[PDB]
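[job 0412] stage=fold_complex status=start
inputs:
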Amino acid sequence: TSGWTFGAGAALQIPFAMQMAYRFNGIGVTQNVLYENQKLIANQFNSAI
Amino acid sequence: SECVLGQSKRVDFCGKGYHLMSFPQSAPHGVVFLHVTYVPAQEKNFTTAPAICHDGKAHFPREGVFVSNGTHWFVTQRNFYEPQIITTDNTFVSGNCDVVIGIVNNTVYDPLQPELDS
Amino acid sequence: SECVLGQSKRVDFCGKGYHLMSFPQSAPHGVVFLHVTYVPAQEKNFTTA
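[job 0412] stage=fold_complex status=done
writing structure:
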């Protein structure tokens, strides 16, 4: 619900899709690809779990 | 090495919060570190969208996030509320916006227009 | 602290690949981490300058 914010201070809500976009930007990948392939990415994550 | 001689990106290594710097302090048979960290203080709920439609094209913030007060939309920093007008400099375009989920229609301001008039 | 409460740039620390997020899981006298990592999949040759 709060990404990494709750680990560095007060927890701040954020949509999980936008949190994954934050991660994608962190790994050096443009966030737009996440929104363009969100369904596929979520499917892959569920399959991996 | 990582807290005093530099700014560590590791979480909770050089203190709790966003690390800024540290100051060593000698102790008998030990050492004391004074980790200075940046901590967000006061929150505010905002309505946010992953992108924006201007002319059938999806717009995303180059760095920051789209937020919306009661009426208007702005692009602000990820760790501090500094709203700004949605401009072509603040955002980058990518394809059309019939693919993104949750996109919201809005105008994207063009800095070139006012100067082109003169 | 690093893998769960944040995104780590350390290679092969929070699993192998480009770390995105991790999920802790309690175990008897131990802990289990589910490291989610972005992994390039399909390569393609290009000429670069």
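[job 0412] summary: The interface with chain C takes residues 4, 6-8, 20, 23-24, 26-29, 45, 48-49 of chain A (CB under 8 Å).
[job 0412] exit 0
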